[PDB]
Amino acid sequence: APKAVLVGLPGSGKSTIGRRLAKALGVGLLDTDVAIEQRTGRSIADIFATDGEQEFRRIEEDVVRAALADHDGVLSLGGGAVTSPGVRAALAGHTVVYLEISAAEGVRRTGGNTVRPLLAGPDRAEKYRALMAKRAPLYRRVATMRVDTNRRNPGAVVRHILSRL
Numbered sequence: 691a692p693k694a695v696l697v698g699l700p701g702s703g704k705s706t707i708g709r710r711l712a713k714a715l716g717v718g719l720l721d722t723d724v725a726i727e728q729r730t731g732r733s734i735a736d737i738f739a740t741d742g743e744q745e746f747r748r749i750e751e752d753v754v755r756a757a758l759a760d761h762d763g764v765l766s767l768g769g770g771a772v773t774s775p776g777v778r779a780a781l782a783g784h785t786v787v788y789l790e791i792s793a794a795e796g797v798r799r800t801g802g803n804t805v806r807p808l809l810a811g812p813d814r815a816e817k818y819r820a821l822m823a824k825r826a827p828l829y830r831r832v833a834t835m836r837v838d839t840n841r842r843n844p845g846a847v848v849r850h851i852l853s854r855l
């Protein structure tokens with residue numbers, strides 16, 4: 691089982707805290723989105739655009755279940771993985787760290803244009819708050835550890851988690 695599975699909204703720090711937490715533990719980081727692009731050679735988008743949700747999610751769940759079983763390092767879950775009941779079911783029993791972030795800070799951390807599909811240019815703040823009302827309850831449900839990242843720098847978040855593992 692993974693040392694920790696990180697979940698949270700876009701920009702809550704899944705990739706960043708995941709990378710730094712993994713480095714600290716001397717283990718590898720497995721990001722489900724990446725495992726998907728590598729498994730299919732297709733980018734996240736093409737899959738969506740082409741196959742769409744149901745098919746992506748099915749693939750994503752497939753990747754998550756395998757990672758939860760084979761990966762012993764840090765696992766960062768794609769932001770929407772928790773919307774699949776099969777994923778929430780597979781997570782039961784695992785150490786799940788929910789990186790919490792306010793909408794104001796979250797939307798500002800993602801302004802990097804690093805490819806945030808569900809956060810188009812037109813009124814991102816409004817879209818981010820909607821995404822939060824929708825995903826937040828799910829993260830809280832699967833979370834075994836809730837970590838507030840609002841005023842904590844990445845190092846402090848990492849140390850906070852390490853202390854509770």
Ligand SMILES: Nc1ncnc2c1ncn2[C@@H]1O[C@H](COP(=O)(O)OP(=O)(O)O)[C@@H](O)[C@H]1O
Nearest residue numbers: 699700701702703704705706799839842843844
């Ligand atoms: N605790 C933090 N404090 C300040 N900035 C952060 C923190 N965590 C993440 N960030 C920054 O916010 C941006 C989004 O982080 P990222 O890990 O890619 O988020 P996610 O993978 O959840 O979508 C990155 O530039 C990252 O360095």
Ligand SMILES: [Cl-]
Nearest residue numbers: 755756759780
């Ligand atoms: Cl399984």
Ligand SMILES: [Cl-]
Nearest residue numbers: 717718762763
């Ligand atoms: Cl590993």
Ligand SMILES: [Cl-]
Nearest residue numbers: 699700768769
């Ligand atoms: Cl995300």
Ligand SMILES: [Cl-]
Nearest residue numbers: 779780781782
């Ligand atoms: Cl299960």
Ligand SMILES: [Cl-]
Nearest residue numbers: 841842843846
């Ligand atoms: Cl600080």
Ligand SMILES: [Mg+2]
Nearest residue numbers: 704705706766
């Ligand atoms: Mg990420």
